[PDB]
């Protein structure tokens, strides 16, 4: 049996309208194993409002179990520690995993958009780049849109630790050259705790 | 199984395999070695043939009451890039069991990286330092090295993202060099150098200056 503990999604912690939660996952549960149980703690204080799903077989003939705990936004953002403790009913062993927001003064992401290189302009598709740098902690969401509508054809690097202790990443949106040369307006939007309203967006066009 | 999981085998650095004057090494590491354990021994094999030039370091104590033992094998650049398999077999002296790990370069047709340089965003130009960006894309395997230079000298205030798997099965990454706005303003030429097995002479460079 092996245990994984996952943080809330950056968008959830940052929107008053959304609900952040932490997720505790147990794999390699033998069909023989007694009921997998969860005890959840917030800064050492046990809480009882988690939601556990029955075990589910996997493509390797093992079972998997998932417990979800809703968190308060300010609790997560204030650096509270979430601990999941996993055991089997009537056995003594336990495994504990903990997760919390990185500690340290939050720092505002600097967001810059970059057009395609002239050398790439010879191709049928071109790259639109959004540099996001100087942010702390690394929890962040980056999306693209055009003329107000979500664009999907992008990939974003993981946050990378910079020499000054902040993070940066790049997001690359691929578009048809014709759409770029038509003058369409593309936008990068970034959500982060150290932004006003937790949100900023920057435009990019020819 | 707890035994199998305490041997790790690491590849050489991408830059070391691409220049025959550098020294690419495969590294076999055994952790959780006990003080009650006889000497940790290594046998190394290249495509199943035993080689004898590895260098094994004495056990080094870790701050968790265990020892780590490392063996380092120098590899021929051409062997690694041609896909030979490297095997490390670990045993304890006087006992018969062993644990084997194998590594080799990623399989798949290599693909040449396209390298583009991008100047700072006009909005960044109001700052004291600006970002010069190198976009490297379309490459395979993901083994790659990127560095920046100017006027002969390595520039070293730069950081590079890990490769990211793209939809077509190739990789891309970005490297960001940070430089005083003044040095960009003065018309200094900055260059992004890229080393990858699918590049002619394993190396290409692209430069950027104020325009
Ligand atoms: C007691 O302590 C020891 C020592 O740790 C140290 O001391 C303690 C007290 C602490 O202070 C601790 O923080 C200190 O580090 C503990 O030893 C550790 O044991 C764990 C396992 O229990 C090992 O975990 C693996 O880590 C691998 C990555 O290791 C590298 O990166 C970490 C940092 O992220 C470093 O700390 C490591 O040292 C490794 O660093 C690399 O080392 C290479 C060899 O030197 C370097 O390459 C060489 O570099 C030189 C120049 O320097 C030349 O260039 C050479 O040419 C080159 O070869 C390399 O640069 C360097 N990198 C970096 C960034 O530093 C993980 O890869 C590995 O994950 C695999 O296995 C997992 C299973 O455990 C699995 O979950 C993973 O998914 C992954 O699985 C693999 O995946 C691939 C494909 O995805 C598959 O093909 C594989 O088959 C698959 N393998 C599987 C499934 O097995 C592990 O997480 C850890 O490495 C080790 N530390 C050290 C220092 O040895 C010990 O555990 C403690 N014991 C107890 C009881 O507490
Ligand atoms: C049988 O088949 C099973 C299914 O295929 C298989 O189960 C897998 O077992 C693996 C090992 O036993 C296990 O591997 C781990 O994976 C960790 C990351 O997992 C995520 O990403 C995977 C893709 O890489 C996905 O497949 C996973 O499902 C998981 O995906 C995430 O899922 C969560 C929860 O559902 C989700 O979060 C929630 O999303 C919802 C949306 O509905 C909400 O928004 C919630 O609010 C939100 O919380 C994520 O979005 C989702 N993400 C993604 C990207 O999909 C990986 O991190 C583990 O590595 C760590 O631990 C190992 C040691 O075990 C270390 O070696 C390794 O280096 C990592 O070390 C950690 O590093 C951290 C620092 O960054 C540090 O903090 C940790 O302490 C440290 N841990 C250490 C040192 O131990 C690990 O490799 C895999 O996830 C299982 N897959 C599934 C689907 O469960 C089973 O093994 C098979 N049996 C066999 C083969 O015998």
Residues on chain B touching A170 (C-beta within 8 angstroms)? 133, 161, 174, 176
Q: Are residues B59 and B156 in the same domain?
A: no
Q: Are residues A41 and A122 in the same domain?
A: no
Residues 6+ apart with CB under 8 A from A67: A23, A24, A25, A38, A40, A50, A51, A52, A53, A84
In what helix (H) or strand (E) does residue B183 lie, and over which residues does it extend? Answer: helix B181-185
Q: At B155, which CATH number?
A: 2.60.40.10
Nearest-CA residue of chain B relative to A116?
B118
Instruction: Please state how this structure was obtained.
Output: X-ray
* DSSP 8-state assignment for residue B26: E
Q: Are residues A94 and A105 in the same domain?
A: no
Q: Which two tokens stand for residue A85?
A: 């403790």
Confirm if A147 and A184 have CB atoms less than 8 A apart: yes
The data reach a resolution, in angstroms, of 1.9
Atom of ligand 1 nearest to the CA of B101: 89
Q: Are residues A125 and A190 in the same domain?
A: yes
Confirm if A185 and A147 have CB atoms less than 8 A apart: yes
- CA gap B99, B66 in Å, rounded: 19
Q: Which of residues 90-129 of B touch A (CB under 8 A)?
A: 114, 116-121, 123-124
User: What's the domain count of chain B?
Assistant: 2
Facing A158 at nearest CB: one of B119, B162, B172:
B162
Domain boundary among B88, B104, B120: B104
Q: Are residues B13 and B26 in the same domain?
A: yes
Q: Are residues A4 and A73 in the same domain?
A: yes
- CA gap B155, B148 in Å, rounded: 5
Confirm if A114 and A20 have CB atoms less than 8 A apart: no
Q: Are residues A29 and A105 in the same domain?
A: no
Ligand (nearest to CA of B101) = 1
Domain boundary among B72, B89, B104: B104
Q: By alpha-carbon position, which residue is closest to atom 9 of ligand 1?
A: B63
Atom of ligand 2 nearest to the CA of A12: 46
Domain boundary among A51, A72, A100: A100
Q: Are residues A144 and A163 in the same domain?
A: yes
- B52 to each of A53, B42, B43, B44, B55, how far by Cα in Å? 54, 10, 8, 7, 9
Confirm if A83 and A97 have CB atoms less than 8 A apart: yes
Q: Can you give the residue range of the structural domain that contains A8?
A: 1-100
- CA gap B69, B31 in Å, rounded: 7
- CA gap B139, B164 in Å, rounded: 10
Q: Is B67 in the pocket of ligand 1 (CB under 6 A)?
A: no
Q: Are residues A130 and A37 in the same domain?
A: no
Atom of ligand 1 nearest to the CA of B64: 9
Q: Are residues A17 and A89 in the same domain?
A: yes
Cβ distance A131 to B133 less than 8 Å, yes or no, reads yes
Confirm if A37 and A53 have CB atoms less than 8 A apart: no
Q: Is the dihedral of CA A143, A145, A149, A154 positive or negative?
A: negative
Q: In this complex, is the C-beta atom of A163 within 8 Å of any C-beta atom belonging to chain B?
A: yes
Confirm if B17 and B62 have CB atoms less than 8 A apart: no
Q: Are residues A117 and A88 in the same domain?
A: no
Closest CA of chain A from B114, distance in Å: 9
Q: Are residues B123 and B201 in the same domain?
A: yes
């Amino acid at each position: 049996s092996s245990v994984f503990l996952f943080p809330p999604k950056p968008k959830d912690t940052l929107m008053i309208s959304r609900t952040p939660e932490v997720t505790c996952v147990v794999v390699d549960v033998s069909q023989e194993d007694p009921e997998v149980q969860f005890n959840w703690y917030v800064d050492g204080v046990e809480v009882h409002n988690a939601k556990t799903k029955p075990r589910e077989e996997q493509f390797n003939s093992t079972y998997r179990v998932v417990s979800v705990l809703t968190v308060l936004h300010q609790d997560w953002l204030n650096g509270k520690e979430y601990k999941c403790k996993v055991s089997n009913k009537g056995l003594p062993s336990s495994i504990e995993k903990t997760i919390s927001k990185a500690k340290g003064q939050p720092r505002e992401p600097q967001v810059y958009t970059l057009p395609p290189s002239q050398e790439e302009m010879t191709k049928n598709q071109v790259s639109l780049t959004c540099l996001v740098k100087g942010f702390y902690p690394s929890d962040i969401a980056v999306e693209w849109e055009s003329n107000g509508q979500p664009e999907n054809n992008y990939k974003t690097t993981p946050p990378v630790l910079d020499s000054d202790g902040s993070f940066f990443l790049y997001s690359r949106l691929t578009v048809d050259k014709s759409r770029w040369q038509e003058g369409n307006v593309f936008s990068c939007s970034v959500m982060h705790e150290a932004l006003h309203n937790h949100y900023t967006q920057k435009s990019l066009s020819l």
